[PDB]
Write a protein that holds these residues in place. Sequence first.
Motif, PDB file in Angstrom:
ATOM      1  N   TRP A  41       0.814  -1.230   0.000  1.00 34.58           N
ATOM      2  CA  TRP A  41       0.000   0.000   0.000  1.00 34.58           C
ATOM      3  C   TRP A  41       0.835   1.262   0.000  1.00 34.58           C
ATOM      4  O   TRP A  41       0.759   2.080   0.894  1.00 34.58           O
ATOM      5  N   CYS A  43       1.878   4.384  -2.742  1.00 38.06           N
ATOM      6  CA  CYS A  43       1.388   4.987  -3.989  1.00 38.06           C
ATOM      7  C   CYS A  43       1.981   6.376  -4.191  1.00 38.06           C
ATOM      8  O   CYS A  43       2.143   7.138  -3.220  1.00 38.06           O
TER       9      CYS A  43
ATOM     10  N   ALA B  40      -4.090   6.435 -12.041  1.00 42.69           N
ATOM     11  CA  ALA B  40      -3.059   5.508 -11.588  1.00 42.69           C
ATOM     12  C   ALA B  40      -2.884   5.560 -10.069  1.00 42.69           C
ATOM     13  O   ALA B  40      -2.483   4.564  -9.455  1.00 42.69           O
ATOM     14  N   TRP B  41      -3.178   6.721  -9.453  1.00 40.77           N
ATOM     15  CA  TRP B  41      -2.849   6.937  -8.032  1.00 40.77           C
ATOM     16  C   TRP B  41      -4.000   6.621  -7.103  1.00 40.77           C
ATOM     17  O   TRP B  41      -4.480   7.461  -6.368  1.00 40.77           O
ATOM     18  N   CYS B  42      -4.428   5.370  -7.152  1.00 34.98           N
ATOM     19  CA  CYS B  42      -5.495   4.819  -6.341  1.00 34.98           C
ATOM     20  C   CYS B  42      -4.905   3.625  -5.605  1.00 34.98           C
ATOM     21  O   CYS B  42      -4.284   2.797  -6.222  1.00 34.98           O
ATOM     22  N   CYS B  43      -5.069   3.574  -4.287  1.00 36.14           N
ATOM     23  CA  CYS B  43      -4.431   2.530  -3.473  1.00 36.14           C
ATOM     24  C   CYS B  43      -5.344   2.096  -2.333  1.00 36.14           C
ATOM     25  O   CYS B  43      -6.041   2.934  -1.732  1.00 36.14           O
ATOM     26  N   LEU B  45      -6.365   1.193   1.372  1.00 35.78           N
ATOM     27  CA  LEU B  45      -6.061   1.880   2.646  1.00 35.78           C
ATOM     28  C   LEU B  45      -6.390   1.041   3.876  1.00 35.78           C
ATOM     29  O   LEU B  45      -5.716   1.200   4.914  1.00 35.78           O
ATOM     30  N   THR B  53      -7.593   5.118  -1.046  1.00 35.68           N
ATOM     31  CA  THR B  53      -7.211   6.470  -1.340  1.00 35.68           C
ATOM     32  C   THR B  53      -7.225   6.664  -2.845  1.00 35.68           C
ATOM     33  O   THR B  53      -6.950   5.719  -3.600  1.00 35.68           O
ATOM     34  N   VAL B  55      -5.905  10.055  -5.613  1.00 36.77           N
ATOM     35  CA  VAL B  55      -5.406  11.403  -5.826  1.00 36.77           C
ATOM     36  C   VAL B  55      -6.146  11.969  -7.023  1.00 36.77           C
ATOM     37  O   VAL B  55      -6.115  11.392  -8.118  1.00 36.77           O
ATOM     38  N   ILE B 130     -15.054   9.900   2.621  1.00 31.21           N
ATOM     39  CA  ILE B 130     -14.883  10.325   4.026  1.00 31.21           C
ATOM     40  C   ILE B 130     -14.247  11.716   3.907  1.00 31.21           C
ATOM     41  O   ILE B 130     -13.045  11.819   3.661  1.00 31.21           O
ATOM     42  N   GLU B 132     -12.191  14.940   4.119  1.00 32.48           N
ATOM     43  CA  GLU B 132     -10.962  15.316   4.817  1.00 32.48           C
ATOM     44  C   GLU B 132     -10.492  16.589   4.167  1.00 32.48           C
ATOM     45  O   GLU B 132      -9.675  16.564   3.258  1.00 32.48           O
ATOM     46  N   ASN B 134      -8.370  19.099   4.730  1.00 34.03           N
ATOM     47  CA  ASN B 134      -6.955  19.415   4.602  1.00 34.03           C
ATOM     48  C   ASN B 134      -6.256  18.510   3.593  1.00 34.03           C
ATOM     49  O   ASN B 134      -5.506  18.981   2.754  1.00 34.03           O
ATOM     50  N   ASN B 135      -6.537  17.217   3.671  1.00 31.46           N
ATOM     51  CA  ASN B 135      -5.922  16.281   2.700  1.00 31.46           C
ATOM     52  C   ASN B 135      -6.325  16.639   1.273  1.00 31.46           C
ATOM     53  O   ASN B 135      -5.497  16.632   0.350  1.00 31.46           O
ATOM     54  N   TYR B 139      -3.115  18.101  -0.502  1.00 28.85           N
ATOM     55  CA  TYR B 139      -2.536  16.967  -1.240  1.00 28.85           C
ATOM     56  C   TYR B 139      -3.402  16.396  -2.323  1.00 28.85           C
ATOM     57  O   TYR B 139      -3.004  15.402  -2.916  1.00 28.85           O
ATOM     58  N   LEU B 141      -5.777  14.553  -2.033  1.00 30.38           N
ATOM     59  CA  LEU B 141      -5.869  13.160  -1.559  1.00 30.38           C
ATOM     60  C   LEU B 141      -7.227  12.915  -0.949  1.00 30.38           C
ATOM     61  O   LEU B 141      -7.603  13.556   0.049  1.00 30.38           O
ATOM     62  N   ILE B 143     -10.028  10.030   0.554  1.00 31.96           N
ATOM     63  CA  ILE B 143     -10.217   8.773   1.278  1.00 31.96           C
ATOM     64  C   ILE B 143     -11.663   8.367   1.180  1.00 31.96           C
ATOM     65  O   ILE B 143     -12.562   9.203   1.386  1.00 31.96           O
TER      66      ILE B 143
END
Lengths: 191, 191
Positions: A41, A43, B40-43, B45, B53, B55, B130, B132, B134-135, B139, B141, B143
């Motif tokens: 995990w 990324c 691509a940037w899915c992972c 958690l 997650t 991006v 969910i 977030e 600040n994230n 970022y 990012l 969740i």
Amino acid sequence: HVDNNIAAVELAKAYRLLNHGPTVLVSARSQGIDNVMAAAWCCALDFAPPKLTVVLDKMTKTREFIEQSGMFVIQVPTVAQLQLTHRVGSQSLADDANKLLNCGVELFEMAGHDLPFVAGCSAWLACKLIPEPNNQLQYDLFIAEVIGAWADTQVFNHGHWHFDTAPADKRSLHYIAGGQFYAIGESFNAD
Amino acid sequence: HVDNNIAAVELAKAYRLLNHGPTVLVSARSQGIDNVMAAAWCCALDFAPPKLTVVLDKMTKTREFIEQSGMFVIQVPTVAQLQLTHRVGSQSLADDANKLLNCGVELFEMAGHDLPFVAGCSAWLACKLIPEPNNQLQYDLFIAEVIGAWADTQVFNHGHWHFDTAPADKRSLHYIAGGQFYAIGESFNAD
Ligand SMILES: Cc1cc2nc3c(=O)[nH]c(=O)nc-3n(C[C@H](O)[C@H](O)[C@H](O)COP(=O)(O)O)c2cc1C
Ligand SMILES: Cc1cc2nc3c(=O)[nH]c(=O)nc-3n(C[C@H](O)[C@H](O)[C@H](O)COP(=O)(O)O)c2cc1C
């Protein structure tokens, strides 16, 4: 055969080392003690400057080291490192101080960093933690800036992977469950 | 040949759909309009209950839809969907309302969700954001909790992928750069 030829990876292309979603090894040092674990995990998070995420369970000794030092290495293991990868992900340093010798992990140092790098991997990313208390507590989610990147030029060079031409045992590993992984496969190009 | 047979994936095993790090399609709906992009940037958690997650760049129309609705689908495209995947990741719905018909995307609905699912993928995960702040701001990012999971039983069944026995064109795609991807490859089992 000869030692792998290591080259720096332009920092702006470092994200490409993880773009295909390989399972990685996470290494860290704290008070002179090194550790390595497996992480599926992990990324990419940003391109320039590069950043990444990694999920680290509260039970892991490696997480403790990262919290204490604020630094770690993310590296891409090879099919040749299948047993090593599974072993470092199935044993904790908390239970045996000799974990690394038990798991067959050979470490080296690079670019003046106070960090352990795993010999035999295809690529390495030196990471500086960006502390995020809530993410780390609530989600076990760690964010880092990538401050340096390097790779074995037989398998990654000039910003691209070359799995098709490199030896088969340098392919990356992509974990599912148990002891089962898939190696990366065939190259495709969209029209 | 016949329609793909879709089965639910036990929620506790849903994380396995992403464990090998495939590039995914992100779909979402807002005020009755659907969209799909490549990520691509899915992972993964968490395992149970599953979380992931992703991006999402501030420039994307899909991000706007997710912020507005709080729901999306993550789905695993196939090698057969190479052009579709690259196209939805190279065109924005903000520039052409007909994006989906231009990109060859066929949508369907499933399990009473007010969500678009992409036909032809190997697996789908229904996700509830969910929030977030600040994230998301700092970022990009996001969740989410995975609230439902399904897959084509020819390629994933009883909690495991079966790329080795499924048709070659059902393999997952793992992006690097430009139009270049790697398909998932050979299965390996650690000792
Ligand atoms: C293939 C594989 C992938 C893994 N992925 C993760 C991961 O993403 N995050 C995590 O916290 N643990 C993961 N684990 C478990 C840790 O690697 C494992 O708990 C390890 O023993 C921790 O070692 P340590 O306590 O010495 O740090 C994984 C294990 C394996 C075998
Ligand atoms: C293979 C591939 C992977 C991509 N990965 C991401 C990603 O992880 N996150 C992101 O924000 N954009 C990513 N992109 C870019 C978006 O898919 C692209 O900007 C898309 O046109 C957005 O469409 P939309 O504006 O209609 O939502 C990717 C593109 C491709 C081709």
